[PDB]
Design an enzyme around this catalytic site. Structure first.
Site, short mmCIF file in Angstrom:
data_model
loop_
_atom_site.label_atom_id
_atom_site.label_comp_id
_atom_site.label_asym_id
_atom_site.label_seq_id
_atom_site.Cartn_x
_atom_site.Cartn_y
_atom_site.Cartn_z
N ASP A 61 24.90 34.19 7.18
CA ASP A 61 23.68 33.85 6.42
C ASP A 61 24.21 32.62 5.48
O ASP A 61 23.46 31.30 5.78
CB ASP A 61 23.05 34.87 5.47
N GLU A 177 16.84 40.50 5.43
CA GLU A 177 17.32 40.98 4.30
C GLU A 177 16.32 41.73 3.39
O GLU A 177 16.44 42.63 2.86
CB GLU A 177 18.18 40.16 3.49
#
Length: 262
Positions: A61, A177
């Site tokens: 990420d 997430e």
């Protein structure tokens, strides 16, 4: 009856998270890179600031967000001639071997304008030592509370660099997430702009690959990311996993809102 309502729940969660539709073509992938780079540049212009700050952990990420940030400022320097535009990658070392190797490999991939290293160890230890509330805690709870101190002081360090250098702090949150609330409130959830917002995990990886990340870095609540992404895109998945995702989303809503007010 149950199915129809669960379907509506899934759709409303995907809309709240602004889930990006699955990529159908290379045009889709390139359009998303261009859009998110333009978004990053627009945040800088609107703020009147020139610097971007991001902790590079070694994970995909922050690798993806870092690649977008570096390309964004390169383009701004070229277009504006203003050499003050800069991306500062921040190394926040800890003691996970693979992570640090991945972090170095990530930095090597990004080739950020600037790299700074902040060891938060002394600050975390010095805070811990002054918290009588840590005394006597069960070990599992103590490790969790200390873990969140670490996440929040990583935020503080990035904001200090941004304040010193007239910058914005980039966060790496995305839809996979966010739906699980898999971040520390006012720790890694805390940033000025989140250019991966709305992406499923496999979409983050797709962008990383298209941005030039090596394959080993791209593929670096009892639920998997494949399950989470299927849920976000309304694709088939085990009913039990959908249940856990929905229950987790509801429990963590306060992490995705402003502070409660009367």
């Amino acid at each position: 009856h149950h199915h129809h309502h669960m379907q509506q729940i899934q759709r409303d969660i995907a809309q709240a998270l602004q889930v990006q539709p699955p990529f159908q073509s290379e045009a889709d992938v390139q359009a998303q890179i261009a859009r998110r780079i333009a978004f990053i540049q627009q945040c800088l212009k609107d703020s009147g600031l020139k610097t971007l700050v991001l902790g590079i952990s070694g994970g995909v990420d922050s690798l993806t967000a870092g690649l977008l940030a570096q390309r964004a400022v390169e383009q701004l320097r070229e277009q504006t001639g203003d050499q003050a535009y800069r991306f500062i990658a921040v190394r926040l070392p800890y003691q996970v071997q693979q992570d640090e190797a991945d972090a170095q490999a990530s930095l090597a991939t990004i080739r950020a304008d600037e790299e700074q290293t902040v060891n938060i160890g002394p600050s975390v230890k010095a805070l811990a030592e002054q918290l009588e509330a840590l005394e006597g805690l069960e070990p599992a709870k103590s490790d969790f509370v200390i873990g969140n101190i670490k996440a929040r002081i990583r935020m503080v360090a990035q904001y200090a660099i941004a304040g010193a250098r007239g910058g914005l702090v980039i966060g790496t949150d995305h839809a996979a997430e966010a739906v699980m609330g898999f971040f520390t409130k006012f720790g890694d959830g805390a940033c000025d702009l989140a250019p991966l917002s709305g992406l499923a995990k496999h979409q983050v990886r797709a962008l990383a690959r298209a941005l030039g990340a090596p394959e080993n870095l791209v593929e670096k609540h009892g639920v998997t990311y494949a399950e989470i992404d299927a849920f976000l895109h309304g694709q088939p998945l085990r009913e039990e996993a959908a249940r856990v995702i929905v229950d987790t989303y509801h429990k963590t809503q306060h992490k995705r809102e402003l502070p409660k007010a009367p």
